[PDB]
Design a protein around this ligand. Structure first.
Ligand SMILES: C[S@@+](CC[C@H](N)C(=O)[O-])C[C@H]1O[C@@H](n2cnc3c(N)ncnc32)[C@H](O)[C@@H]1O
Ligand SMILES: [Zn+2]
Ligand SMILES: [Zn+2]
Ligand SMILES: [Zn+2]
Lengths: 86, 98, 109, 95, 222, 103, 82, 110, 97
DNA sequence: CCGGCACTGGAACAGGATGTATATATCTGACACGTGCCTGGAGACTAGGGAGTAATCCCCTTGGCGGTTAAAACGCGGGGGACAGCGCGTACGTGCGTTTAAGCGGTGCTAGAGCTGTCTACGACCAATTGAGCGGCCTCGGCACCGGGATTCTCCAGGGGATCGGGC
DNA sequence: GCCCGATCCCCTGGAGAATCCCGGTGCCGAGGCCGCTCAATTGGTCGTAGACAGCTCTAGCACCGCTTAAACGCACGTACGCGCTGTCCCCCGCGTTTTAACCGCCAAGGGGATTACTCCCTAGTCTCCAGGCACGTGTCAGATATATACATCCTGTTCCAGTGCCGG
């Protein structure tokens, strides 16, 4: 029954961890306010997918979010994902 | 006098380094603790598989890497080389999300 | 069964299972009656499509001097051909990376 | 127990040994080609269905499966694959 | 020389005479602003009124500001002051008696409606006797505002190459109207003036006896 | 000797803002029907020869073309205002389409 | 009986009207040859699918539902014709 | 047919045809079988989405001193509601025009 | 005359729901087609999502429970909280009597 | 009024330091192969209807013709907006010393996915019957267009009482 | 010293004036009223899909210890956002004359939508057998670290061009 309450984990997306994604995309010079907006952009994309994964799960009467609920939730938004079983 | 590389090169030569490897660029445990927490608002006491947390990391990375590709075109549109916070909102608003 | 068994994929000269395509069509709630020359036509297309994304992946994997094929070679053989890049436009390939590309304005002088 | 899980693995592997005899393929790569095929299949059949339903019919025939290709594959694929299919269909009858 | 100007039928609105008709609109061809119950001046001077920035006349029955919108400035008719004073050799001219501000609704310009053919006939008739026809303003085609026979106290408005007020063109209730506004705020006592352009049909024998540094020119040249 | 008194012409930016508020209130179609109809019949003459169009089939392409262009010119304007301008140039449409996805 | 040059029927004021409804205040002078190039490639991708939907039914008339289905195939649903 | 007839709409208390929705679910190739409370549920979610749009359409048609809903009011009805604009995001309503909106940096300053 | 064949629509149920929320207004002919098409377009989405739900789980039936989940997946935040209510009420009122 | 002992600016390339690459030992865990077994695909009939084929009827697509007139085309002026060039200073890139969790191996464990056996309520299927829904025919009237008095207001109108310049 | 025939601040006789009240008339489209026919309700029969109750076993959560790669501050100096000013040019508004879009007709025939009638092509059962999936296994392609070999980046000490400015 150990439900260790979680809090303020969005700060695990550090500053270098965002500079690396910006580099992979082709960005040369990064400003100083992008770091607080990329987290806000990510925490919104994540909800719209985890909500649908949990919905697909509740309908099958289970308790384990599986690796196909996520693939279906993504395919439902026009973001098909190859490689994890389809 | 430790040879002091000039600004604009240590970034320009790691651009061309991160565009040849295909690893994952975010930390595993710090990312996993976040997915498990966003999913407390929808149902208490959930359980994630091992391959369900790796299916979201790749989607998130492939979303951000292709948001920054479009940011880096608005910034060049305005005749700049840096990308401010007002470039991301234009990209999203033209795609159709905001 | 006086005659000997002859698979329905050899009558056509194919390698994809016309016997299994037909069943997946019938038991997939796509229509009431399923014709008899439909799976023979669909398998011939499925087999031609998977023999154009592999003829390019082989060539992409031989410029890195390798013998096996890994996901990176599929992303390279897909985003470098203008027809497959339009067919598989909104699709992510896990462990794919991105295409080497750096804008022409940021370069030094 | 551990009943089955069918896939197109042993056919994609057969097609590989025709275009590149001295070549292998990794597990991950295989699990991508499998999904590619499972995805194109129900993207083509899901159009033959709607065609047959728009014309108030009940049979999926070669004509529906062929038109569903010109509405899916772009440009030269739509012109190569169609000829690749009318060969198999022709050879099947004369057998 | 204490005589007075020849009589002119003082009038408050326009009168139709020729072959032209009226295009009175209904309460569906009038634009609607974005103001709202707000400070003392809704649709006011500084108020960012959509209609006021676009030179339209607000309407009391369609605007949300009720009836006190200060854009209704072609019915209140809160005009300038004391009439003809004496000038040197011009006819009479005019002047102001009460001070005004910058960009205020100075009096309108109102008279009779005449068409082009009646206009050419009237000027050619007035030309044989060389009566020196002077009152003839136009706005659009087949519609010319005349102030010769009758008009208002806007007819003795003097010309200059360095004016003080200007002649705009507003749209009031489906129709187009001409209203003169101020360039620069002035205390009471400077004779109001505005420039205008001409159209020569014969020759040019007129000079700008107004008085300024470059104002010599001609009655059709700046 | 004979002259007229013409009023001062509208300041630049008035007859362009009146139309913005006028056309954003009507609902008509904005391209001439016969010139748009000859164009369709010319374009479709490259796929199958000698075919016929229905009266409400030529009238359905026209209500989609307009809603495509009117929605493209709303996303061009934002790029122009982004680059600190007022005028939309030939290089705003390309960025609009590129970011949107069509190219 | 062939046709040609009819792309000049999308005239200059006809594009200014569409722009004004969009919301633009000033307009360059080379937009008029670039808009005719965006339009002529939106019409082809739709008339192609309309003619295909027609040929599949052995007809000779591009009816009004062919166009609606061809527009639905590209995520541009159109209400009010079927 | 030995008793008095009643429709299945009046049983649930709806105004949409529970008899016609069942037929479309059957003859449309959605699944091999169809439960018994699927049409009764699917019609009560269609009358609600229709009421929610016709009410806003009537409200926006009242505010032009008009008494009849025409295709412009349906456009102005969805484009201003934050959820219906998202349900009908990629949908064109024939002869609807657009929304009144001028960018705040184009207006003549002072 | 060949007695033209009947073609069905929701043009008389759209016209009955209107007189419950506005007892005096009307509706236009070219603006009834839009509501017809809206119903025909929303019915198909909510049915074609229940189809896939019942197929992922290896079932063979649409019930009053695939439709409830398809609605939660299709409708946005607040819409999908009164629609579920109206549904789960119009079935309780039907299974009772 | 243009120049000479000695001054002042403009250009470039080796020389390090770094970084990416060249060829090898070594090794290990994942890919490619048989092997045995089951279940799903192939062969042969039989019965019912969905679609191919021919012939009709009439809707409606395309084709001229003329006439009124609103929208497209063209050229002239004048001023606001796009673009280049300078100048100041603020914020981000780079390198280094250090603190803080991420990553990698064992170990335990138990919660829950997965699989199989009964069996019972629930939906497909058939016959019949009657009432709802669709096409067609009449309506009525709420509103667009005109008049008719005609009320509220002025306006052109010459005229009833002051006014006076001389008049008496 | 008083008075009178013409002459002006004011007035009102009609005429006008023009616009609110109120009333007819004529309609595209909508709103109701019957004849019809065929799809939805009722009532039963029947067979399979789905709901429970076990029962095995595996894989997700939780812990602990150790090493070291990555996050974090911190300082500097520099390339680059951002404001300002000047200039000129190209896009907008205002006329004039030209052209072809709209509208209202009449007119002849292509082909879309039905209907009747007779195949032949697919669903559906049995019967039988081989293709494909899980399991255990060997061995070799690719991933590490080591060492050395050139590309790239950056600068500072030599290297022409012209004169600093003073003058006779
Ligand atoms: C309104 S009238 C002026 C009549 C009279 N001079 C007055 O001011 O009362 C305008 C005419 O006066 C003539 N004019 C020319 N120069 C003038 C000036 N400087 N002041 C007044 N009128 C002038 C012009 O011919 C013009 O047609
Ligand atoms: Zn206002
Ligand atoms: Zn107002
Ligand atoms: Zn002057």
């Amino acid at each position: 029954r150990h439900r260790k309450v979680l809090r303020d984990n969005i700060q695990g997306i550090t500053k270098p961890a965002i500079r690396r994604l910006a580099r992979r995309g082709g960005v040369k010079r990064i400003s100083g306010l992008i770091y607080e907006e990329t987290r806000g952009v990510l925490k919104v994309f994540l909800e719209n997918v985890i909500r649908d994964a949990v919905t697909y799960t509740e309908h099958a009467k289970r308790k384990t979010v599986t690796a196909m609920d996520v693939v279906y939730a993504l395919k439902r938004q026009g973001r098909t994902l190859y490689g994890f079983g389809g | 006098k430790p040879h002091r590389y000039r600004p604009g090169t240590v970034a320009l030569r790691e651009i061309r380094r991160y565009q040849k490897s295909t690893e994952l660029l975010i930390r595993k445990l710090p990312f996993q603790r976040l997915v498990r927490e966003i999913a407390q608002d929808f149902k208490t006491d959930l359980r994630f598989q091992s391959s369900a947390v790796l299916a979201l990391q790749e989607a998130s990375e492939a979303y951000l890497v292709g948001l920054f590709e479009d940011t880096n075109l608005c910034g060049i549109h305005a005749k700049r080389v840096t990308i401010l916070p007002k470039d991301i909102q234009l990209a999203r608003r033209i795609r159709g999300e905001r | 069964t006086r005659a000997k068994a002859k698979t329905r994929s050899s009558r056509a000269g194919l390698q994809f299972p016309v016997g299994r395509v037909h069943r997946l069509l019938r038991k997939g709630n796509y229509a009431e009656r399923v014709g008899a020359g439909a799976p023979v036509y669909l398998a011939a297309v499925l087999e031609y499509l998977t023999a154009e994304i592999l003829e390019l992946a082989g060539n992409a994997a031989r410029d890195n001097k390798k013998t096996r094929i890994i996901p990176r070679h599929l992303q390279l053989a897909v985003r470098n051909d203008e027809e497959l890049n339009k067919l598989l436009g909104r699709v992510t390939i896990a462990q794919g990376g991105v295409l080497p590309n750096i804008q022409s304005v940021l370069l030094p002088k | 127990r551990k009943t089955r899980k069918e896939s197109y693995a042993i056919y994609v592997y057969k097609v590989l040994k025709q275009v590149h005899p001295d070549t292998g393929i990794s597990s991950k790569a295989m699990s991508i080609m499998n999904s590619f095929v499972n995805d194109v299949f129900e993207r083509i059949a899901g159009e033959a269905s709607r065609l047959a339903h728009y014309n108030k019919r009940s049979t999926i025939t070669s004509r529906e499966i062929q038109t569903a290709v010109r509405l899916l594959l772009p440009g030269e694929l739509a012109k190569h694959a169609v000829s690749e299919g009318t060969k198999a269909v022709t050879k099947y009858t004369s057998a | 020389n204490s005589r007075k100007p020849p009589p002119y039928k003082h009038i408050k609105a326009n009168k139709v005479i020729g072959k032209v008709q009226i295009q009175v609109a209904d309460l569906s061809e009038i634009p609607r602003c974005n103001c709202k119950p707000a400070d003392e001046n809704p649709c006011g001077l500084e108020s960012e009124c959509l209609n006021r920035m676009l030179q339209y006349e607000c309407h009391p029955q369609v605007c949300p500001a009720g009836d006190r919108c200060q854009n209704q400035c072609f019915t209140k008719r809160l005009y300038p002051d004391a009439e003809i004073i004496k000038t040197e050799r011009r006819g009479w001219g005019l002047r102001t008696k009460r001070s005004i501000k910058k960009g205020e609704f100075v009096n309108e310009y109102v008279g009779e409606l005449i068409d082009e053919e009646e206009c050419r006939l009237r000027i050619k008739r007035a030309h044989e006797n060389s009566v020196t026809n002077f009152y003839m303003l136009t706005v659009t085609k087949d519609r010319i505002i005349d102030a010769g026979p009758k008009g208002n106290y806007s007819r003795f408005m003097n010309h200059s190459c360095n004016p003080n007020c200007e002649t705009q063109k507003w749209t009031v209730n489906g129709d187009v109207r001409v209203g003169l506004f101020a360039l620069c705020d002035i205390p009471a006592g400077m004779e109001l003036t505005f420039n205008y352009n001409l159209d020569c049909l014969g020759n040019g024998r007129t000079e700008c006896h107004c008085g300024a540094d470059n104002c010599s020119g001609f009655l059709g040249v700046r």
